[PDB]
Amino acid sequence: KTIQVDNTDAEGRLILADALCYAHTFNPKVIINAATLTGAMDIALGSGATGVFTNSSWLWNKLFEASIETGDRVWRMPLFEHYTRQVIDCQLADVNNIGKYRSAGACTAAAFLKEFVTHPKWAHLDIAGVMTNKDEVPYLRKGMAGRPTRTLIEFLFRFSQ
Amino acid sequence: TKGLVLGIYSKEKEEDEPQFTSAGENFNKLVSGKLREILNISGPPLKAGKTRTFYGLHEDFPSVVVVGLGKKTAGIDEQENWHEGKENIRAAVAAGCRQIQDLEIPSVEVDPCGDAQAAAEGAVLGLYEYDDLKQKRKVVVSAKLHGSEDQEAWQRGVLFASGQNLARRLMETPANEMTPTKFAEIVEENLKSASIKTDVFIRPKSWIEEQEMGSFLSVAKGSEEPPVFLEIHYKGSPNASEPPLVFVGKGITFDSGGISIKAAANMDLMRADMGGAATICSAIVSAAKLDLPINIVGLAPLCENMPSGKANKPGDVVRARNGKTIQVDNTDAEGRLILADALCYAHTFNPKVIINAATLTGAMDIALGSGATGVFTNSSWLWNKLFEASIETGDRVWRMPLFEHYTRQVIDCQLADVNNIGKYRSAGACTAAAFLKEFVTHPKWAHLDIAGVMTNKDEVPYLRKGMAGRPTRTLIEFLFRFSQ
Amino acid sequence: TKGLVLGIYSKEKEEDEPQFTSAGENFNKLVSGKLREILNISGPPLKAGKTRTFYGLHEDFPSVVVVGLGKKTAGIDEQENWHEGKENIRAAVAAGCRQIQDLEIPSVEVDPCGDAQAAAEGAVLGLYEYDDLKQKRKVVVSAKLHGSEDQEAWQRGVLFASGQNLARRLMETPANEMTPTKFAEIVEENLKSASIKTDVFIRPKSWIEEQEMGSFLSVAKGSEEPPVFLEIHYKGSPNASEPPLVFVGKGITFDSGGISIKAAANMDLMRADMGGAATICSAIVSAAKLDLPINIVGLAPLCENMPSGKANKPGDVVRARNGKTIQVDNTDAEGRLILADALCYAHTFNPKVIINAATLTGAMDIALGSGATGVFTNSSWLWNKLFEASIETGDRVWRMPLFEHYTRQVIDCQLADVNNIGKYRSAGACTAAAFLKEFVTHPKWAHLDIAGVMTNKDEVPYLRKGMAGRPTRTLIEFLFRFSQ
Ligand SMILES: CC(C)C[C@H](N)P(=O)(O)O
Ligand SMILES: CC(C)C[C@H](N)P(=O)(O)O
Ligand SMILES: CC(C)C[C@H](N)P(=O)(O)O
Ligand SMILES: [Zn+2]
Ligand SMILES: [Zn+2]
Ligand SMILES: [Zn+2]
Ligand SMILES: [Zn+2]
Ligand SMILES: [Zn+2]
Ligand SMILES: [Zn+2]
Ligand SMILES: [Zn+2]
Ligand SMILES: [Zn+2]
């Protein structure tokens, strides 16, 4: 697939396109990616929760249940064709790396990633809003947060049982 | 002359050719196979939402527009959270009616396409245009059901669509015409027309003052346009004492930002900052037309937000109806100021549910755009009812978080009990919702931030470019199901 | 499937019905009047630029698209400075061809509409689309003249339009593919395919250094992409010694602004900052194809403008080929820097005229937008020839002033002979032209600032959204007339 690089700063989705493609070669049970992808996600939910875009409600529920236990929360965001339409509308190539509008930046970014995924159980975690901590999470000093590492570990533990 | 809109589905694997609807096949037979013949000659098959026009097939229908309906059995799409078949019908019929109008034909008969309500919604929503102030206008088209079998369903669709179009008219009209007073008067005439079991109170400034609505008053004083507090009642329950459902809508007729003035680019769209009031009032009008067996109260504080020698000043502290003080750090975060007072007043009715709608934050647009209305609620039962209703209407809703995490950022206030803007710039829609919550104690409250669905370019196929009137039908559907 | 495009004029006061073209009435006669009957049944008359489709009228043409041509006797419009009849034809034919393509029909015959060249231009320019890098593409349409009477005129239109389309291709192609070297190679192959009486020299950086083109070199050094100086010769005159006409074009394959970096919004359009080179080179290729009896030389300095550890720094002083020093106050005013050296080199050919084209200033866009190319010239004779040619092609030009008033603002310089930006923002296109003039001593020089006509949205009806390739046809027409 060809990609029109209209904005060089929308680079995360460019490197993820190739990694997601390579992920399919392992014939995996699930594919879960995490990225400090968009400033839009921060404007959307801030540090309250990691945004999760997934084509599997079963997968959403497992991540959600794990977050309840860890306290490092997740919140579902939409994967709609409405957003896909705005990234495949492209002057020169198959897909554009930025949407035709500023609205729903995190959603159009997720739609871009989806054009590189055919797996039935895929989840994209936009962690841009939980990159840092000031005083929101009481038990983390000011600085980089490392979220939602514990939620991923809990998900893996439960899955293995 | 009269035009005709007919549907055809996408061909199924086992089928030899794409199948017309019952009405399409009947017409084909009426014209001795000429419709099928000409469609075949015209080339490639018609896909969902596409159209093709054939002339002179029958003396009574000089122009026949065939529209693609997609897969006949398309039902609820688990990935899109909507009934796909209904959405396909709405889009296809709208496209077909637009073609007939471009041909300057004044009357059109429409194929029910297996779902007359959806067909009517596509026709009535699709043809709508606010052109009262223009000298050059498109031909006025009168759309009617082709056949008579599904008339009740067709009429229901016309009703739902008309409710949304009233919201669109109110939102689109320029603010120098659509003042707080004018808005109230239009809602009044429509509600009384809908049912005699109604009461309308166009409350003046003196009443607003007696009610101690200091937060709402602070926003209104900057402008010379008189503010009003619109209160409407629909007494549909058999039991007069049955607790009502209360709806609240943000009614800023024009938002310039006040002293914390807005940038010039596209500020004209702020004439629709009263969209919250438009959608809830229109939903109530429609509920009354439907004669729903429930009691409902609508509340809409209305005023302009303008800069002047007596306008709100950053840092000013105002007192809400409940006695809680608010530090107005930014005069352009005025929606939450007027809603604080309306939400307090909503509790006096001892309601079953409280639902408010508002074009509250630009942050909501950045978050979800026009894909869905953001819903903040302390009740998962309420969320599910709104969600289920949205699947039927196609006018989607998506849940947003109501966490103390966000409350902490608005109660951290230098001078007062609560600050009208958060301590940080992140999660603007969430902190705005947290602010509203500080004025709510009810167990079943939902806040709808409709800022991202205020307008349509071409995302929703069946709405022309302009104010959208979303999500009026979802509110009407919620009310209908609630009453059953 | 085979399609047919036919034209119809607007009805005159004393006519009973609007008149078809000769081809339209011939087809109507062939089908015993069925074309007129169905057009009448379909409703309102077709106005200029509008279309309507009729199916199954004849076995050889399952799809017939009728297009409105406007007033039949529409000639030169003194208010618009163009031949209106030709513009109406280009628009109508393009619209008709787009409909044929939407129907996925691979071949179409086109009514010459009283002016085969204009008809061909509308079809070829209208159907063009740069889609080499996409998996999903529209059906390739093969447009040909309907009938056998106006073959030469039709092919002339195909040739003129093809020249413009080559320019559009070069402009639209992403900069990572369309490098200085690639541009030079593509122009080389097209010119050689056009005529054997051609010579091409893709001059390397070593030659640029020998030529002491310090101003051009200063812009190129910031990027890793090698720069080249394209020099092309078309030897069309019967007399080998006849002085040539010289064309010069700005070839910035990508303009990031350099150290004086551009803002992000829409910076992708800067892949077309080599439009001046594209248009002048394409005009020469077309002149060669037509075998015009004249000698022509084309010059195009090509390079990228990028930021790096070795790029031009604001305040740096560079020396042009003619010995003049230039103070580079803004690295993003790079077009005038590369043109200074190319214009100097142009004088070595003892030319009859010197014409340069460049996407030079945003100021030109603020001035005239896409309405017309701005022309600065020291020769009224030259202005008039360009103006007259534009009336015929419809791709308009508009004169801009070459006054000492502007020169004064660029020679007022702290460190050098001339500053690359004016002392004020006012008249940006005029001060830019004044800068170029300091490198020209020729009596017949014209500078075309094409920045405003770089792209098309919907302004020129017969060009789809994208890079425009303007004013290629106006340059070709100028050359044709000059040769006669
Ligand atoms: C603020 C931050 C999360 C932005 C991303 N790094 P982007 O520039 O790739 O969108
Ligand atoms: C863009 C729009 C939704 C902004 C709100 N009217 P505010 O200025 O009150 O946040
Ligand atoms: C908008 C465009 C025409 C600007 C020129 N490339 P400049 O940056 O060289 O002025
Ligand atoms: Zn980035
Ligand atoms: Zn990044
Ligand atoms: Zn309005
Ligand atoms: Zn505001
Ligand atoms: Zn507002
Ligand atoms: Zn290019
Ligand atoms: Zn530049
Ligand atoms: Zn440039």
Side-chain angles (χ1 to χ4, degrees), chain C residues 250 252 255 262 270 273 305 332-335 359-360:
Chain C
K250 173 187 171 180
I252 296 294
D255 189 10
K262 288 185 181 302
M270 295 301 101
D273 208 28
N305 187 208
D332 195 18
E334 86 297 323
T359 43
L360 206 67

Side-chain angles (χ1 to χ4, degrees), chain B residues 153-215:
Chain B
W154 175 269
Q155 290 173 356
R156 188 181 183 79
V158 176
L159 190 156
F160 274 61
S162 288
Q164 183 168 351
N165 287 345
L166 175 53
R168 294 167 80 188
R169 169 193 165 192
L170 299 169
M171 290 173 74
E172 196 78 70
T173 304
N176 62 316
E177 171 63 25
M178 193 54 59
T179 60
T181 298
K182 190 61 174 189
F183 179 95
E185 294 176 335
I186 299 306
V187 166
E188 173 176 51
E189 63 180 3
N190 277 274
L191 187 63
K192 300 308 297 182
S193 188
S195 165
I196 199 174
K197 297 180 286 201
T198 56
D199 286 294
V200 178
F201 306 94
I202 303 180
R203 318 274 193 198
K205 187 171 183 174
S206 62
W207 179 93
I208 298 163
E209 294 171 332
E210 297 162 354
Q211 288 290 316
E212 292 167 2
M213 293 183 167
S215 189

